[PDB]
């Protein structure tokens, strides 16, 4: 997260991380046994950590749970990035407490202009590397598809929406992918891609979770 602020502990109990040796992506716990992330965050084996605030300074009450099932959207496209969403089933149910809690699926798409909360342990610089240990937050508006397509000609599919500031300065960044965008208490977005981070006229592109609500329910259902 570039141009953000360290989140209050732990006011983001639905934030998770994906690990394989090291932290490589974010995610969002949407039920006791299910996490939503990005399909480009796929690996064969993943460890999910929940209830983390500082990822390198463990406080005793974080949960480490392996992925039993790792399911990319079946129409995920490597080249265009269309349908960049993935489900992970936890090999055991997370314990719900005040550190670890679910976030609600969206009941409608976000209105353009609404303020959203984006979070993650991504890079805090637009140029160079400063990967934070502490979870960072950014408040940013959902942009119109007009703004979005004007920033990325020809590249915005129906699965994508922009959140951020065309001026630049404030954005998600590398290691934020898979993480949540929350507007008015619902998960609206999954961190996806962008051209650099926080660059001028280059807002972050996110997957519209609302478009997948039936696919997520059906996949949860088929995998009990």
């Amino acid at each position: 997260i570039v141009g953000g602020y360290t989140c209050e502990e732990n006011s983001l109990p639905y934030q998770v991380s994906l690990n394989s040796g090291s932290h490589f992506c974010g995610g969002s716990l949407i039920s006791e046994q299910w996490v939503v992330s990005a399909a480009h965050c796929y690996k064969t084996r993943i460890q999910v950590r929940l209830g983390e605030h500082n990822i390198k300074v463990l406080e005793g009450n974080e949960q480490f749970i392996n992925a039993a099932k790792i399911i990319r959207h079946p129409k995920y496209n490597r080249d265009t990035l269309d349908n960049d969403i993935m489900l992970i089933k936890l090999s055991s149910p997370a314990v719900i407490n005040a550190r670890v809690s679910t976030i609600s699926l969206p009941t409608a798409p976000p209105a353009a202009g609404t303020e959203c909360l984006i979070s993650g342990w991504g890079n805090t610089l637009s140029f160079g590397a400063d990967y934070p240990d502490e979870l960072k937050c950014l408040d940013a508006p959902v942009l119109t598809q007009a703004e979005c397509k004007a920033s990325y000609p020809g590249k915005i599919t129906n699965s994508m929406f922009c959140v951020g500031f065309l001026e630049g300065g404030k954005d998600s960044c590398q290691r934020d992918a898979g993480g949540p965008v929350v507007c008015n208490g619902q998960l609206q977005g999954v961190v996806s891609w962008g051209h650099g981070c926080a660059w001028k006229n280059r807002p972050g592109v996110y997957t519209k979770v609302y478009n997948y609500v039936d696919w997520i329910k059906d996949t949860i259902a088929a995998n009990s």
Binding site: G21, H40, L81, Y131, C173, Q174, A177, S192, G194
Partner: protein, 54 residues
């Protein structure tokens, strides 16, 4: 030829730890790969990068 391409994070926002041949240093250096696009100067380990590019 691939050994002289710049390290490319690519547009995606994952944080994978990767390796690329840095022609300035004459060896392999780490970088962060976003998880899509970029180029083929992009290896899983230092040892394999050096077998391909050293």
């Amino acid at each position: 030829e691939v050994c002289s391409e710049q390290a490319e994070t690519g547009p995606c926002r994952a944080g994978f730890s990767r390796w690329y041949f840095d022609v300035t240093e004459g060896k392999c250096a780490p970088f962060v790969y976003g998880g899509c696009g970029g180029n083929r100067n992009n290896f899983d380990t230092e040892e394999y990068c050096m077998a391909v590019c050293g």
